Amino acid sequence: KIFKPEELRQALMPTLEALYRQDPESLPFRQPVDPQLLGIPDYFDIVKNPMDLSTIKRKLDTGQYQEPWQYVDDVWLMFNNAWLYNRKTSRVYKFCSKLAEVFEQEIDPVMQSLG
Ligand SMILES: CCOc1ccc(C(C)=O)cc1NC(=O)c1cc(NC(C)=O)cc(NC(=O)c2ccco2)c1
């Protein structure tokens, strides 16, 4: 019912590492979207709440996820943002879908273990 921050981090960190391990698929996701650098100035006309792997990793490393579902919700925020902004035929959309497939495989045994 109640989780300790370090045990939560140890349970969840391998699922995040499995996303970082996807290369090149995780590359658009390893740092916050920079619309200036990427040439996509409408990004924040479309995406309300940005999220990326580096932000999730810091929240995990500083104990900000006190329930497993808060971690999962940030991962899916990252996915949903990319599916929302990018065309279904685009690199980032396809890479996002690959990451979601990987995550779905990795997170299920972990959540079964945690609750
Ligand atoms: C041009 C529009 O870019 C985007 C548009 C939208 C979104 C989102 C998340 O909604 C993300 C991006 N970012 C990328 O596509 C992107 C960014 C970086 N690195 C940096 C630091 O920006 C690297 C790569 N490299 C490869 O994907 C790659 C390399 C080799 C094979 O594949 C791609």
Q: Return the CATH number at 16.
A: 1.20.920.10
Which amino acid is residue 99, in one-letter code?
L
∠ at Cα 71 (96, 35), nearest 5°?
45
First CA to last CA distance, the chain = 8
Resolution of the determined structure in angstroms stands at 1.8
Which residue among 92, 93, 96, 99 is best mutated to probe the pocket of ligand 1, counting the most ligand atoms within 8 A of its Cβ?
Answer: 92
Q: Which of 27, 88, 28, 81 is nearest to 50 (CA)?
A: 81
- Is 54:75 a contact under the CB 8 Å cutoff? no
Q: What are phi and psi of 34, to 5 degrees?
A: -115, 95
Scan for tokens 């300790």, then name that residue.
4
∠ at Cα 98 (69, 74), nearest 5°?
25
User: 115 CA to middle of ligand 1, Å?
Assistant: 35
Q: Is 48 left (phi over 0), alpha (psi -120 to 50) or beta?
A: alpha
What is the distance between the alpha carbons of residues 99 and 20, in angstroms, rounded to a whole number?
9
Identify the domain containing residue 36 by its residue range.
1-115
> Does ligand 1 come within 6 angstroms of the Cβ of 41?
no
Name the method of structure determination.
X-ray
How many structural domains compose the chain? 1
How does 26-54 read in b/e, with b if 16+ C-beta sit within 10 Å? bebbeeebebeeeebeebeeebeeebbbe
Which amino acid is residue 86, in one-letter code?
N
